[model samples]
Target: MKGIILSGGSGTRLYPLTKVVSKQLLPVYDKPMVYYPLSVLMLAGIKDILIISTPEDTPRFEQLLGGGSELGISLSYAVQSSPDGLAQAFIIGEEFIGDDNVALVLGDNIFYGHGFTELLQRAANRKSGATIFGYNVKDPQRFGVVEFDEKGKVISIEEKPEEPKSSYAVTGLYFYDNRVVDIAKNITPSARGELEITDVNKAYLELGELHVELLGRGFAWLDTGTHESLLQASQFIETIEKRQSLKVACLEEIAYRMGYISREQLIKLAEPLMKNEYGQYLMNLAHR
Candidate 1:
């Protein structure tokens, strides 16, 4: 399976801070917001990845991540000229996606927790249908909510419903079979004139091919679109790293652990940034 990071958005919620930069490039504690989602794809063992961003910000992402070869992955980029919608990524990345199963992750979504890598791997290993995660949130009205039966089967889903059927809000990460391209193409734009991802999932749901994974209390699914949420995400990362002395979403460390890069390669990558604790952590991993 391949992965796509949808980093295209106006980020109007962030106002002046995003006026000159893509929100994904903003720091979430010690790392850019994109790192968290990219790390998720890496942990899932995806080697070919596509990053979808605005034309103005696309070059910056290319410069930051390069061709992804250094991390044992193939990286390609595409431009999303507008904030069309989440599902628009599939249409834009159709050529890159080709005939492979794909995972789509919003760049501003940060996921971290125990056994999260295993969860991602399981989802990535799926052979057919679409897989989405449901996280219990306090404000279900602000998100696309998924309702499940007592047996854990998906019963209903709604996009930002005023009267939500359940508290489980669908998370930003999604896994779909190759059929997604055609599915996305067939979806009609909502009243807001955007191709809603909910429509895609609902199509799978109607075909009895949508699977919902529940993210219980152990996981953290952070939405960094708003100023307050962005600050909160940064603080969460800072607190966790400071307490454990372990960096979160450190790409070099992840590459080494995943066997994508050798210990020597990791050490070499860390050498340039050794002036900081983040780099030192990677260097220390070489000894372990």
Candidate 2:
């Protein structure tokens, strides 16, 4: 499957901080925010990925990700030009997606939990249909709420409903088959003049092909949408990394653990940065 990270926006919420940098490029802790979602795609066994960002930010992303060649993955970038919609990712990445199944993760979305890798794999391995995730949130009204039946089956979904049917909010990551390209192309712009991803899910739902994977306890789905939320995500990662002395969303670590890069390669990637503790950690991992 192919993976796409949709990261385009002026980031008005962050103001001066984001005045010069894409929000995805901001540090979540020790690593950039994009690393978390990039690691998610890597953990899902996706090797070829597309990053869609604004023209101004695309070059920076290319510099940061660097073709993803050394990591045993292929990284291609596209310019969104504008923040048309979340569903625009599919349209922008249409050629890169080719005939493969695709996984789309919002660049600002960070996911962490036990057994989340297995969940990602299961969703990525789908032969057909589209898969979205549902996370239990206290403020469902602020998100796209998902309602389920007695058997935990998806019964209804609403986008920013004033009165939500359930407390489960749909997460940003999505998995879809090749059909998504056409589905995205045919979808009309919403009243807000944006092609809504909710519409894409609805199309799949109408076909009885929409699947919702509920993240039970011990899961965290974070969207770096606000200043407070961004700091919260940073702190969350800081706590985990500090407590275990193990980096969270470390790209080199993920590449090594997934066997995408060899021990020697990992060491080489670590060599130049020996001045810092992050490099030392990689060097230590190289030895053990």
Candidate 3:
């Protein structure tokens, strides 16, 4: 399977700050927000990845990740051109996905949990069908609410419904088979003039090919879109990392543990940032 990180958006909610840089480039804590989702895909055993973004902002991603060669992943880029809904990424990345299954994660989405990597790996192994995660949220109206049957099967899903059927909200990470390209292409623009991802899930659900995984209390799924949410995400990361003395979403360590990069490569990567505690942690891993 491959990965696609959708980083394109007007980011109007962020205003001035986004005027200077893509919202995905904004810092969640110690690193850019994009790193979290990118790292999640890397941890899921995806080696070939495509990052979709605006024409102007896509170059910055290249500057930051650069074909992912150093980390042992093949990286490519596609231009979204306009601010379309989340499902549009499937259309833009159709060729990048080819005949392989694909996992798409929003660039601004940060996911952290005890067994997220294991869940992602299992989802990647599904040869046919779509897999999406559901998190119990306090405000289901603000997200795509998922309704499950008595047997724990997803019965229905709604995008930001005023009256939700369940507290379970669908997250940004999605796993789909090659059929997604056709589904995304045939989908019509919603009232908002954009293709909705919820519609894509509904399509899969119609065929009884959609599976939903519930994220229990331990997971942290954050979307750093608005200014306030961005601040909260940063504070959350800082609080956790400082308290534990372990970096959250530390790319070098993740790459090494995933065997995507060698220990020597990790050390070399760490050498430049050794003045800081994060660098010291990476260096220690190298020596160990």
Candidate 4:
């Protein structure tokens, strides 16, 4: 399966900070915000990734994760000319996603939980239909919410409903078969003048092909769109990593453990930053 990271948008909620750089390039705790979603694709065993960003920010992404070769993955970029909504990524990447199943994750969403890699791998291996994970949120009205049966079947989905049917707000990560490209292309823009992802999922639901996996109590899914949320996400990562004495979303380590990159490759990647805690953690892995 291919991976697409939609990192576009003006990021108005982030104001002046985003005025100078793309929100996805901003630091989230110890690394660029895009790293969180990029790591997700890596963990899912996806080596080919296409990042859809604004024309202005697309070159910077190439600079940061050029061809993904340093980590043994292939990286590509596309330009999303306007804020056309999340589903537009499929339309924008139709050629890149041609004849292949694809996974799309919002570049600003951060997910850290036990066995996240395993969960992502399973989703990527799914050969048919669409798979989307749902996180229980206190305020589902603020996002696209999913209502599911007790058996875990998705019954309905609402996009920012005045009264959400359930608290299972869909997180940014999504897996879909090749048909998703056509599904996305056929959908008309919503009242908000953009193609809504919720509508795309609804089309899959109509065919009994939508699967909503609930992220139970152990998951931490954060979307850092606003200043407050960005700060909170950074703090959360800092607290957890500080307490555990381990790094969160350490890509090189994950790549080695997953066999995407070799021990020697991991060492070469770690050599330059050996003084920092993150570097030390990677060095320790050489002995493990």
Give lDDT per model, in order.
0.92, 0.92, 0.90, 0.91
The candidate 1 region of ten consecutive residues with least summed lDDT is 276-285
- Could you tell me how far off, in angstroms, the CA of residue 269 lies in candidate 1 after the best superposition? 0.4
lDDT of 1 by residue, 1-288 (tens): 999999979879898989998899999988889899999999998989999999899999999999998887889999998988899999999999998999999899999899989889999999899999999999999999999999999989889998999999999999999999999999888988899999999999998999998999889999898899999999999999989888888887888899899988888888998998777888888989
Q: Kindly provide the TM-score of model 4 when superposed on the true structure, using C-alpha atoms.
A: 0.97
Best of the two (1, 3) by TM-score: 1
Of 2 and 4, the candidate ahead on lDDT is 2
Q: Which stretches of candidate 3 lie over 4 Å from their true place?
A: none
* lDDT for position 170 in model 3: 96
TM agreement with the true structure for every prediction: 0.98, 0.98, 0.97, 0.97
lDDT of 4 by residue, 1-288 (tens): 999999989989898998979999999999899999998998999989999999899999999888888888889999999988988999999999999999999999999898888889888999999999999998989999999887989889989999899998988999999999999999898899999999989999998999987899799999999999999999999999889877777878778887888888888987997989778889899768
Query: How many clashes show up in model 2?
Result: 0
Q: List the residue pairs that clash in candidate 1.
A: none
| Candidate 3 lDDT by residue in tens digits, 146-254 | 9999888998999999899999999999999989989999989988898999999999999899999899989999899898989999999999988987787787788
Question: How many clashes in candidate 3?
Answer: 0
Off by over 4 Å in 1: none
Sort all candidates by lDDT, best to worst.
1, 2, 4, 3
Q: Lowest summed-lDDT stretch of 10 residues in model 3?
A: 244-253
Would you give me the overall lDDT of model 3? 0.90
Q: Return the TM-score for candidate 1, rounded to 2 decimals.
A: 0.98
